[PDB]
């Protein structure tokens, strides 16, 4: 009964910023972590960062500087913000629930295309 739904901007121009929302249902944002994962067209999964139930966050060292993750416990929403988009920022972006060393529930993802 967990449900995660992502919504994003679709097509965006290089250098602009991107904001993605992960709306969750059936569980509490205070009791679980939420991870952000992306997938470039035809490539593998790439871990972006996580926000813990307590509000502490962790990021991919390589992207750390371009990314921001936050949440609104009240609204049951987690957000991903990326500044200075590159064309290779094109991918399907997913949010997934984290429980004891495992991503048990995933949203269906949202496609972002960085195109001028």
């Amino acid at each position: 009964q967990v449900q995660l739904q992502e919504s994003g901007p679709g097509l965006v121009a290089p250098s602009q910023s991107l904001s993605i929302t992960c709306t969750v249902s059936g569980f509490s944002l205070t009791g679980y972590g939420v991870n952000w994962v992306r997938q470039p067209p035809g490539k593998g999964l790439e871990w972006l960062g996580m926000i813990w139930g307590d509000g502490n966050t962790d990021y991919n060292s390589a992207l750390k500087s371009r990314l921001s993750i936050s949440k609104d416990n009240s609204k049951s929403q987690v957000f991903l913000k990326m500044n200075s988009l590159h064309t290779d920022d094109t991918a399907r972006y997913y949010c997934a629930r984290e429980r004891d060393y495992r991503l048990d529930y995933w949203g269906q993802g949202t496609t972002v295309t960085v195109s001028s």
Partner: protein
């Protein structure tokens, strides 16, 4: 960061065959390893966690093993429902994903 290397990158197999895919770590990950199955146009799905534990609903034809920097996923007698992409992921400090293994019907 600890990287994961998956082998083979792609494999062709027939229904009923038994396959093994490998996940190697560039540093000891102490068994904090999960496996995901991804079908065309769907989000990944958890198969195995903590090296050998199956997620609910996962058929028993699937089994994981390993320790240290070497892990495996064995699929006994492939079903049509099993073709797709497989990913291993660790949780030893910053999580990373292996490159994936493409399982394609021969």
């Amino acid at each position: 960061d600890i990287v994961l290397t998956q082998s083979p990158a792609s494999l062709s197999a027939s229904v009923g065959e038994t396959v093994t895919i490998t996940c190697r770590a560039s540093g000891n990950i102490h068994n904090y390893l999960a496996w995901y199955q991804q079908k065309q146009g769907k989000s990944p799905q958890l198969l195995v966690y903590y090296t050998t534990t199956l997620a609910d609903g996962v058929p028993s034809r699937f089994s994981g093993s390993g320790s240290g920097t070497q892990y495996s996923l064995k699929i006994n007698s492939l079903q049509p429902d099993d073709f797709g992409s497989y990913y291993c992921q660790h949780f030893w400090s910053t999580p990373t994903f292996g490159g994936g293994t493409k399982l394609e019907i021969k």
